[PDB]
Amino acid sequence: ALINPQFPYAGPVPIPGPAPTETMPLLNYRVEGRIAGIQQARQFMPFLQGPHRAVAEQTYHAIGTGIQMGQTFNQPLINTQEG
Amino acid sequence: DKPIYTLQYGNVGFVVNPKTVNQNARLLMGYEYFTSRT
């Protein structure tokens, strides 16, 4: 702010002001609020809580069976070298 | 804001139920996506 003498800035907005209204009042709000609809315990989703496999491992079962059977052919006898 | 991401909520699919189907009809699908580089 600058004040300049001799033209000085009025020393106030004075008493000639026009009170325009008495509408100043905010009427307090008084209220009762009830949000009470029956609630049912459940919601349907496509899927909740699953941690789906991105790849599975290979998996398997097992079997064996049979017996011990055989047809054989042997090497001929040979002269013994030494000993 | 909420990208389609299977593994977050099972398999998801884009669906079209056609009223009329001419010979050689097909759906050309275009996707915009983010992915993971393992």
- DSSP one-letter string for A28-63: PP-------PPPPS----S--S----SSPPP-----
d(CA B34, CA B5): 10
Q: Residue A72: how many CA atoms within 13 Å on its side-chain side? A: 6
Distances from the Cα of B17 to the Cα of B13, B22, B29, angstroms = 13, 14, 15
Chain A CB within 8 Å of residue B7 CB? yes
Rg, chain A, Cα only: 53
Would you state the torsion angle of the CA atoms of residues B21, B24, B25, B27, taken in this order, to the nearest 10 degrees?
160
Contact B6 A46 (CB under 8 A): no
**Which chain A residues contact residue B38 at CB under 8 A?**
none
Q: Which residue of A has its CA nearest to B6?
A: A52
Site of tokens 């804001």: B1
Distances from the Cα of A82 to the Cα of A16, A79, angstroms = 146, 9
Chain A CB within 8 Å of residue B9 CB? yes
